[PDB]
Amino acid sequence: EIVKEVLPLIRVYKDGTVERLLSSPNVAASPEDPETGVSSKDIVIAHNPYVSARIFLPNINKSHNKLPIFVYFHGGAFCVESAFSFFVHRYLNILASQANIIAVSVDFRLLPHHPLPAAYEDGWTTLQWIASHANNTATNPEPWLLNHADFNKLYVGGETSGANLAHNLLLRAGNGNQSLPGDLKILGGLLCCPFFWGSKPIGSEPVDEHEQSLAMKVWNLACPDAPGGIDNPWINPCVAGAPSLATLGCSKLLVTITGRDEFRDRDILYHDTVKKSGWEGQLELFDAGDEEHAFQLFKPETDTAKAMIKRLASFLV
Template sequence: MDTDIAHDFSPFFVVHKNGTIKRLMGSSPIPAPQTLNGAKTKDVTVSSDPKITVRIFLPESASPGQKLPVVFYIHGGAFTIESALSIAYSSYVASVASKCNAIAISVDYRLAPEAPIPACYDDSWEALKWVVSHVAGSGPDPWINEHGDFTRFYVAGDSAGANIANTIAIWVSTKGLGCDVKISGMILACPFFGHEVELDKIWKYCCCEETGVNDPRLNPAASPDLLAKLACERVLVFTAERDFLRERGVTYYKALEKSEWKGEVESVETEGEEHVFHLIKQDSEKAGDVMEKINSFINHK
């Protein structure tokens, strides 16, 4: 081990003794505007302090005035790596927009540990409020005004992004968005939830609050009363057979199913695959199966 390293969170990042943080993985940013996987893209600044950016994806095939489902997407990366602006996430969310014929908005929240948890939740919440400010067709972005159908509004995320999605969907009930918008459904892929101290060392290091393994943001299954407040009608949970976080997704699904939440939850497992395979191997047959399931979920096919 490098003797200059104070904290080793491989394969995500390391912290050197002088405080320097070095990320060990993550894909490079890709600029907008451009057309990507059948969707036009652009970036919009939601907040300048703190700086919060969203990348918006509109299907090339959308005709003027055509109303489309709205998908609010939250990227993963253990709260510490990746970006809504990265090659991996831009290409994937563009595909969600084009293949599901939806307008998608992906939030580029601040990363830990430089911006300690709960910054990722707070930034995603602010971005969500910005998105729903378009419900009456008079928000700041013309694409969302023209094409957003908020009677078909979905929140989605993978890994840590799925974790954040669950929390903000609960906040819709407990905090309120200040407008009459309902979440039609939530899509969680390979969610990063917690229940074991050793596996949750990143959370412990990155969170600036004194919390334990049963913090409802980290481990929602431990708080069935809060799960019952989930502000959506349907939930779709994807797990992968060889994912090191598989049991966390399964535990969440079972807890939600047993809670007093009144919606419908479905779990889909992909055999032989690992964590976020649908993102890493976007052109694979099994990733295509996941996309088709998402399309069916959004468009009720």
């Protein structure tokens, strides 16, 4: 008995069993990935609500300086994909080695059982957990963080909905009422093809088909009780009455887009809005080329993919 369905992403049955789109199976963490030299392990950030993660530590050939931390949130429209998939594992191995940074891939809660803002909270739980290492308030600290992490170089980011998640975290961080343990600051944000939408079609978005877009079905699954619906500031950050993008709680921000991504114009609008908002930080835009969103995870061997990774490495510093 089917209660909910957003094809091709997800089907939900009466008894809470779910069929999910699966683009790659999960793989085991590695003591040393053969191609990149990156070590990875799987850890528990919080038991309840349960939030786990894979942390990636690149080859330590020198240890004069500690390494930037990159908290990554996978794509998958809040309802599919995983922190531990073949694609994410292989991508972060490359990123961690090419950029020489520690990566933390967060397995945040998903629809159907955990509607937004669950995922957002899990992201915030992750950042608190990280900051608790910096001021020695962590209870079961991850030794890799204590030994190798530069806590003043915390970067937060992701793909599509994961990037929407990071964006939301940046706002929380730059809100005066909210702070991290030790008042740790996020240095930078990296949003790759972030999932943003709106009730009115814009740019090259098809007008007649708009109200039937997959983006709208995804959002209705993720947050049906959202006031304003598809114009809720969580999904439409450029909407009237949304918090000002001048309160983004970081100092540097890179937005990446692709030519074929559905959210290209939304992303472009987001960037321009950040620019003409008075946000004082360093703002950057990167057009990765004639590709789909997340293309670099699927085909990291292409010239286009390699150029994107090099770009990211120059940002994650």
